[PDB]
Amino acid sequence: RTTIFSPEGRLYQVEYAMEAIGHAGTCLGILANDGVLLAAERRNIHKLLDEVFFSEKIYKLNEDMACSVAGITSDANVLTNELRLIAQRYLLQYQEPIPCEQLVTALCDIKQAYTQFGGKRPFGVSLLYIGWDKHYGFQLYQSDPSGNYGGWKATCIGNNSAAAVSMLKQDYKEGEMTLKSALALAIKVLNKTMDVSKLSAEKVEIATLTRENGKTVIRVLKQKEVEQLIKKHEEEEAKAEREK
Amino acid sequence: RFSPYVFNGGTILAIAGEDFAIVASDTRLSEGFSIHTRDSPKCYKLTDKTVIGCSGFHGDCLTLTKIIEARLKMYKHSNNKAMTTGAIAAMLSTILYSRRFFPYYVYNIIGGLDEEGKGAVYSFDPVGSYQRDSFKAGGSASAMLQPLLDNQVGFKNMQNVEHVPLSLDRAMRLVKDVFISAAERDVYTGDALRICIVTKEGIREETVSLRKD
Amino acid sequence: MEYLIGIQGPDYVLVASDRVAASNIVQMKDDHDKMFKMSEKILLLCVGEAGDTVQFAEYIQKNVQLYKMRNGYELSPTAAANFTRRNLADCLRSRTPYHVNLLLAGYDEHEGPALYYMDYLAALAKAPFAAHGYGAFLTLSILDRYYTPTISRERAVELLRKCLEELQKRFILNLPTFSVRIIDKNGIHDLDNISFPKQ
Amino acid sequence: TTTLAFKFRHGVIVAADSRATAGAYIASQTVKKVIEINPYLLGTMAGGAADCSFWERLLARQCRIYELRNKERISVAAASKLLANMVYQYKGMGLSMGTMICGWDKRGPGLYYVDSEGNRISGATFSVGSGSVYAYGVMDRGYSYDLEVEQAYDLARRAIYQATYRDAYSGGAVNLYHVREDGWIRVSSDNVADLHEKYSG
Amino acid sequence: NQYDNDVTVWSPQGRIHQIEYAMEAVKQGSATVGLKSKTHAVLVALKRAQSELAAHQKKILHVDNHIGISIAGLTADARLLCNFMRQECLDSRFVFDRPLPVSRLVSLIGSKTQIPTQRYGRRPYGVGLLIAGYDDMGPHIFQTCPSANYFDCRAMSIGARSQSARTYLERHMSEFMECNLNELVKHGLRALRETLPAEQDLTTKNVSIGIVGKDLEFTIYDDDDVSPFLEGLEERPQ
Amino acid sequence: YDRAITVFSPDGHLFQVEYAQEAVKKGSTAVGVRGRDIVVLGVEKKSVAKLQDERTVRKICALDDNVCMAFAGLTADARIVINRARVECQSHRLTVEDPVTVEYITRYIASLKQRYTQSNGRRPFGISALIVGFDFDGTPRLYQTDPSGTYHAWKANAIGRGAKSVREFLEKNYTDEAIETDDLTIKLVIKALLEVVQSGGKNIELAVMRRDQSLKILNPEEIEKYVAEIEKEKEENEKKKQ
Amino acid sequence: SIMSYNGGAVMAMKGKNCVAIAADRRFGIQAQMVTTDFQKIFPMGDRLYIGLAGLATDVQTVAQRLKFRLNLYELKEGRQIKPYTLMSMVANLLYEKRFGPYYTEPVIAGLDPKTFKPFICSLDLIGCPMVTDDFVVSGTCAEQMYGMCESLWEPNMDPDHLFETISQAMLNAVDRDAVSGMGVIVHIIEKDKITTRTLKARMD
Amino acid sequence: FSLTTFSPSGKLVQIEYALAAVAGGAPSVGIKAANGVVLATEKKQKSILYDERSVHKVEPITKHIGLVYSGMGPDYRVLVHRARKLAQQYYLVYQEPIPTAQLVQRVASVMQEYTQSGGVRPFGVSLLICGWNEGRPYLFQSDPSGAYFAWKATAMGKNYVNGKTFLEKRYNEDLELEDAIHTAILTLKESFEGQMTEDNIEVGICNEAGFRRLTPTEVKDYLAAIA
Amino acid sequence: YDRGVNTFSPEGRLFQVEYAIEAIKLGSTAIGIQTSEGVCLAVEKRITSPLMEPSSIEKIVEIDAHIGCAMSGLIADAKTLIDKARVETQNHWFTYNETMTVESVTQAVSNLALQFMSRPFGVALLFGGVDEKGPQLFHMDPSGTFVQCDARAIGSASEGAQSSLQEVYHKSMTLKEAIKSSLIILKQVMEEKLNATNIELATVQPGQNFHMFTKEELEEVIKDI
Helix, strand or coil: CCCCCCCCCCCHHHHHHHHCCCCCCCEEEEECCCCEEEEEECCCCCCCECCCCCCCCEEEEECCEEEEEEECHHHHHHHHHHHHHHHHHHHHHHCCCCCCCHHHHHHHHHHHHCCCECCCCCCCEEEEEEEEECCCEEEEEEECCCCCCEEECEEEECCCHHHHHHHHHHHCCCCCCCHHHHHHHHHHHCCCCCCCCCCCHHHEEEEEEEEECCEEEEEECCHHHHHHHHHHHHHHHHHHHHCC | CCCCCCCCCCEEEEEECCCCEEEEEECCEEECCEEEECCCCCEEECCCCEEEEEEECHHHHHHHHHHHHHHHHHHHHHHCCCCCHHHHHHHHHHHHHCCCCCCCCEEEEEEEECCCCCEEEEEECCCCCEEEECEEEEECCHHHHHHHHHHHCCCCCCCCCCCCCCCHHHHHHHHHHHHHHHCCCCCCCCCEEEEEEEECCEECCEEEECCCC | CCCEEEEECCCCEEEEEECCEECCCCEEECCCCCEEECCCCEEEEEEECHHHHHHHHHHHHHHHHHHHHHHCCCCCHHHHHHHHHHHHHHCCCCCCCCCEEEEEEEEECCCEEEEEEECCCCCCEECCEEEECCCHHHHHHHHHHHCCCCCCHHHHHHHHHHHHHHHHHHCCCCCCEEEEEEEECCEEECCCCEECCCC | CEEEEEEECCEEEEEECCCEEECCEEEECCCCCEEEEECCEEEECCECHHHHHHHHHHHHHHHHHHHHHHCCCCCHHHHHHHHHHHHHHHCCCCCCEEEEEEEEECCEEEEEEEECCCCEEECCEEEEECCHHHHHHHHHHCCCCCCCHHHHHHHHHHHHHHHHHHCCCCCCEEEEEEEECCEEEEEEEEEHHHHHHHHHC | CCCCCCCCCCCCCCCCHHHHHHHHHHHHCCCEEEEECCCEEEEEECCCCCCCCECCCCCEEEEECCEEEEEEECHHHHHHHHHHHHHHHHHHHHHHCCCCCCHHHHHHHHHHHCHHHHCCCCCCCCEEEEEEEEECCEEEEEEECCCCCEEEECEEEECCCHHHHHHHHHCCHHHHCCCCHHHHHHHHHHHHHCCCCCCCCCCCCCCEEEEEECCEEEEEECCCCCHHHHCCCCCCCC | CCCCCCCCCCCCCCHHHHHHHHHHCCCCCEEEEECCCEEEEEEECCCCCCCEEHHHCCCEEECCCCEEEEEEECHHHHHHHHHHHHHHHHHHHHHCCCCCCHHHHHHHHHHHHHCCCCCCCECCCCEEEEEEECCCCCCCEEEEECCCCCEEEECEEEECCCHHHHHHHHHHHCCCCCCCCHHHHHHHHHHHHHCCCCCCCCCEEEEEEECCCCCEECCHHHHHHHHHHHHHHHHHHHHCCC | CCHHHCCCEEEEEECCCCEEEEEECCEEECCEEEECCCCCEEECCCCEEEECCECHHHHHHHHHHHHHHHHHHHHHCCCCCCHHHHHHHHHHHHHCCCCCCCCECCEEEEECCCCCCEEEEECCCCCCCECCCCEEEEECCHHHHHHHHHHHCCCCCCHHHHHHHHHHHHHHHHCCCCCCCCCEEEEEECCCCEEEEECCCCCC | CCCCCCCCCCCCHHHHHHHHHHCCCCCEEEEECCCCEEEEEECCCCCCCCCCCCCCCCEECCCCEEEEEEECHHHHHHHHHHHHHHHHHHHHHHCCCCCHHHHHHHHHHHHHHCCCCCCCCCCCEEEEEEEEECCEEEEEEECCCCCEEEECEEEECCCCCHHHHHHHHCCCCCCCHHHHHHHHHHHHHCCCCCCCCCCCEEEEEECCCCCEECCHHHHHHHCCCCC | CCCCCCCCCCCCCCHHHHHHHHCCCCCCCEEEEEECCEEEEEEECCCCCCCECHHHCCCEEEEECCEEEEEEECHHHHHHHHHHHHHHHHHHHHHHCCCCCHHHHHHHHHCCCCCCCCCCCCEEEEEEEEECCEEEEEEECCCCCEEEECEEEECCCHHHHHHHHHHHCCCCCCHHHHHHHHHHHHHCCCCCCCCCCCEEEEEECCCCCCEECCHHHHHHHHCCC
């Protein structure tokens, strides 16, 4: 149980909830100067699945924020409603959008209380948050099931996160990262990590966050808009095989 | 419509001395222009050293004394001693402010002995503001008794006088003289005069008749 | 009754207030201050019932400073105004309603100066100038007469002085001395007090 | 009722009547309207005597616990705001209190007026009761922060005397106190009939 | 063996062992004796000290002007039940202005202590009481048990080594009725003495007495007020 | 009587309270030194990861103008304790207009932690806190709080991985001489943090408070200067004079 | 009266494939004007607006608490709101205070975001909707605006004429109400554009 | 055993065992044609005494939403009631009939309420929720975990794998509501251990006109491999 | 039977309550002595580092101007019970306007131990003060059992200290002599050099309030040892 320490000062339910995320789909984020994006993989791959929704794993929380999740999905549907309530409570209280760190603190204060108060299970969900505010600009955060958030410039959660992290360490070009550069890196990291090869456009989900005339924008790239990103990858690594 | 109060008459008096304390009262109980009974004393013995008088609405007079009697036993259980006059007074001050927004319509006078044998008289309002005094009157004729006590005990507006301390035999005659006169002008002051004297030897009682008109 | 006055300019917000607390007929204090410093670039001036003013204003300043502690940066004046107006309005149909008339003044690096008027019914409105009390009826005509949006600090203080001379002439109460304070990009500054040698 | 208090060079003076009244009848003329809250704090009584006494005894109960928990004597401002926030939770229910809190702390001589309505003001001169307006005049023409101690005593005594002369619900004795850095000290208890002789001829 | 760790569990033989174990906590306290004549009721206890240089534990408690108890078992249960009794008697004087009978108090005590025997999350009261009182039906001596049961008694002793006192009382019951107070107290003291070793004897320090009667409120005699009652005891050999 | 419940042991121990201190023996080292008009604490850094914004790894956290705080142990429990202390720092100015003192809020935090050792269904806060600050009368203060709800006052202390080795350092070194100026009070903390550090200087973060100033976190441009001064004063004394 | 403590005036009027909405710009206590740029029309989406006349506290409170619900709605939902449904949301919001009522009488005007047919509605302070097909009014000058819209309104009106109609009604109505005026603002909303105008009005 | 407990692998075991109770219930088919949705299931009795016109595995929630399940009928009758209440709450607030996706969300919330406390077991049912909103058909699949999936066709219960491969090899778009019923009955005929009668199955369809449970006559019509 | 406070042993015992007693011997030792001139309290501090300010180790405290406490055991239990005693002593003043006796403070503080909070308090306390009945010393135990004592020692070396007090104690002593005896006993149960920071000492006389000794007054008795 979660209200019990180990002799070595450990909390093993909090570690098992964190081990319950590698079973979930891979989701990464990439920060840039022009914007910030997310990239999830759709393990819901089947000939009879419909895909009615706008997006299955990218959830919009505010006019200036979205999130992606990995882990237990019921827990995600709980936390995504709580996030949307926190944002609107801040708006009602101040009539200004909530910054992209107060929301993460507010959700992590909920996640911390489940590791501490008797008969309830820690949320087996990690999250990534992308958003804009008038204090620090474009941001990217990463929550854990223990109630620990951290700011990042590029991170990955879920299956094969430790490999995408090593790739981003070896290909991120801080200070010179546009949004086309970030998507070109995403299509690479998400192809050198997926078990199913060739990276079908049906098997991914991408969202970009940008600004236009003092308004925030959160779009979702369509199928044909991602086919181009894929086609401009095998060409790129076919040229890195020409020089034999 | 239903008003929860009614004035049942009553008059009470207390005088303190260096080795004694008196608490007196009439015995008439009234209701408007009628008379309920002519044997209903307003004095109640609490301890061997302490006596209380109660005047006003009679239901509160009955409730409050029972509350006091139930608190004395709890004090004795917890502290293994009987209470003092000042402790009872300070406790009653809180019991009365417990009802600050629905008060006990009761005019109270405590009379007993200090912790070195001297007299002690504590007079209360219906909401618990208390005041140690040498003599105090309370009830319907309170406006009639206190001037003569101010004169014949405090020696006020009297020059070149012997400021003699009040002995018990003088105090008792004085106490009888004031009710004999309050029964002539106040219509609530009635049939008998109960007097409870407190001394180091114990507590006595005396009944003296008044006019039944 | 008590008097507040506020004036907004292109790069500043001037505010004043009387320094009088009063029992039935006598003045109990002449060194009184009705301003409450919420932040380095926000003020709150409050008038109303005796206890509601200090309780309400202390609550708001603590809940505004707690923002700075938790988050590391200030609240805007537009956000503090709506926090104040949300807490004044939740309490209105309750068992503890605050009867308080107040101004709010501040400066932000992005939006510039701001002045907000509020009534005891929690209706927020930003204006270029504003007043409270029975002196408003006299001193709002002078502001409408002589105020311009490009008014400078030195002329703003002269307009204020005229507004208070009109109180000393016509107003049925004394109001002998006044606090004066100004806000700008460099914070709050306690200007010299506009007094009147009545006695 | 009539009370007054002013703070000057050598601390705070406190004076008061001794009369209680229920309409036209004079119930008591030996009332102690200055409440010894602690050995280092003083109160006054004006309005509800039962309200003044109860809530200031409750204030004492918290001041002592403060001193025990923290091993430091409370301030005058803190002692005043305790009482104010306590009597603000009964606003409109019908309490009547007007009382000054007097004392010396690390900031200096302190004087604070607290009302059941919710006022809480710091000042150098205050008077409360029906006879307050008759004391304000004398105490205003006769004030100076550089007063001497006996002069301050005389001022307080004569202001209470002149207030008792006019007001009907004010009389009896004049009980005068003096707040210092070594605590407070009771000075006098002077009948108004005595001072009548000396201040007439 | 394994129907013992809870009071809500029966055994295959129809027994609750936690209650039987709570009854064993009365045998850990010092011995008390209770007895009654037709006019008076007496409790005599033997007090026990923790360190030699301390005061003896108080064994007899005042409940009202006509009821008093002597306790053997856990101190905390006794302190809770005494405060229950005191308020139940004050509640009777407040309403009816009469003293509460003793049968109607011990019935309430049983009704109170029956709950921990049946609901889980509460411990059975591991204290036994001997209750001496006087009402409109004469003197009474009541035993109260951790099993939520209670008995009306001519006399009784409870605590460690109380079978000796019980054996003594069982063969002198025919005298207690017409005994005066001195003889009754002496029978109690002798029954108590029968619980000691032959080494020890009764002393002012380790004897408390409680008496109630028609013209006598419940009084307690502890240290030097006991020496009248000790004078008269035959110096027993062994 | 063994692990897994806060009941007791035959020896008279509560092991779930010791196992929480064992979590405080697992975080990063955090030291604190009390001077006359400067008070300095420093905390080891958390091994940055080449793609992380370190603006959010705040180990040192202010509670009011006069009081500050540094913690070791669980990172999330720290945030709740710090917010619940920040609230009380303002509720204390509401209840009485005076500001707060260091012992008041230390006592409050310790009571909050004590409250979580009383019930099952509540887990103790797995942190300690060095709570340094100022007062009226300008008396510098330093306290240390453990999960069990115990608080003491210290001239200098340490918490985390390596506190058992920094305590010996400060035992051998802390005197009235090393608190002559502010620059000597800071060099002591630098040398103490060096005893567990990466032999760097970029793995250090120090803050200071004066009777006048508010909290002031240092930049590496001064940390490097202090560390170079300390490296020079040790190249000259320990080596070039022995 | 209550709602006359602050004043106000709101009107809505349909055309053919368009709709209008108008309000005065004054904020004042009983008889004193404080501010002349007070908001009383609030957007609730593109091609959908709402207007509020009554007690200003309740205006701001209702607008904020409705934007709360609308944002949560269109987040859970994946679609912008229809006017018929905003009407019922407001009705529920107001009937929740059936004995603590907000002192407002809203006016809604919009176009359905698929077929773009116009909609206009009115509600009372406890939420009885009123879906007319000509015009709706709420405020202190309700009779004066009924009298103008009854006489000037025509069934089919292009925006150039609808603007003139809804302006000449509002101006001549608020010019006979003492606590309404100090400016008039108008919104015209079509499938392709939203036009917004402030008008030359009396400031007495 | 316990439900508020993770395994070291990071699995919730009682949820996995509640899905095993779904995997052993009667089969249920679901197909989403272009102009409708079909729901079909096996309603077979243990004797000739059971009156089959008294209980229903196909139930309506509204005029335009309907249900089937695989697993436990007692658990089904709770979620039927809850869904019927939630639809009416939505109507009471908005005066619009609830969309088929919001009901699935609010019902998975109910299924998730029973996954987080101790002293409660999850539901032993999965659902298939058909609808017709905004001129488009819908079909979802709610699970005891609190998770839902939108399908074009699927099968739950006994032999839910071969019954799904059959649909993968024998289902496409450009169908209509009558070509899909034949396919659903053919997908049920795989597991039918006996002669399929009009009373051994139960069928419900949704379309522009709304949801309707077919009658035994209509079942016997298409049971002849007709349409 | 060992774990849980709602479980009786076959012999009718509560082992958790006894293990709460055993938590007192893990605390340093304290001594209290009655005398007709007053009461004394004397304790060891057990400083673990020279860096900690030993004045932050509250092992003797003021409950009121006429009652002082000395404790041994868990710190949290002690904080709770000391706050209880302080609050009760002032509620008594508020109601009755007099000083609570040491017996009644002890009685009221022991009533919290009678509450299964879910755990017995792991702390014993000595209460020294002056009443109408003169100087009084009391001892409270985790079982809520309290009794008047003439001399008592609690804590780690309570056995040897008690086995010495029974010899050096008589009911005729003075306070200066009892203070000397207490420190002589304290000297013998310490493997650290007795000094004016390793101990506290307090007294409560009739005509004087609670008074914790200073370094000067302490060294001026350490010298005559």
